[PDB]
């Protein structure tokens, strides 16, 4: 019963909460080290990446925009779906070997923990 959010106002980077974070949960802060379960599929449903324990510093400047701009909007414990044009993913570059140039992606993200950086 949750709505899509159009993050950038152009239809090309959209997020929906699939499983809300529970009462009292909050958003991660940039500079925290987050751990996510990330599933990536081509807009057609082909699964191209799965990482159950992906650790990264939220806000690192080279994280694809589709994640940098969506993960801060999640609560810890939330699962979200992100639909993102290639413009906000790997663009004309693609991600070898399985993501071609210009691929729109569906990202399913579960934010597991968020911990202060060192």
The single-letter DSSP state of residue 86 is: G
Method: X-ray
Instruction: For residues 81 and 43, give the distance between their C-alpha atoms in angstroms, rounded to a whole number.
Output: 12
Q: Angle at CA 60, nearest 5°, toward 95 and 2?
A: 80
CA 5, 62, 110 angle in degrees (round to 5)?
45
Q: Measured between alpha carbons, how far is 61 from 32 in angstroms, rounded to an integer?
A: 14
Q: Could you give the 3-state DSSP secondary structure of residue 34?
A: strand
Domain assignments of the chain as residue spans, ordered by start: 1-118
Indicate the annotated binding residues. Answer: 60, 62
Q: Resolution limit in angstroms? A: 1.0
Per the annotation, binding residues for Ca(2+) are: 60, 62
Asked if the bond preceding 97 is cis, omega within 30° of 0, the reply is: yes
Please state which CATH class domain 1-118 belongs to: alpha beta
């Amino acid at each position: 019963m949750r709505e899509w959010l159009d993050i950038l106002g152009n239809g090309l980077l959209r997020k929906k909460t699939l499983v809300p974070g529970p009462p009292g949960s909050s958003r991660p802060v940039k500079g925290q080290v987050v751990t996510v379960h990330l599933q990536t599929s081509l807009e057609n449903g082909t699964r191209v990446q799965e990482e159950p324990e992906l650790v990264f510093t939220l806000g690192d400047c080279d994280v694809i925009q589709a994640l940098d701009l969506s993960v801060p909007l999640m609560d810890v414990g939330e699962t979200a779906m992100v639909t993102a044009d290639s413009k906000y993913c790997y663009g004309p570059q693609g991600r070898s070997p399985y993501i071609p140039p210009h691929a729109a992606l569906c990202l399913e993200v579960t934010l597991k923990t968020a911990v202060d950086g060192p």
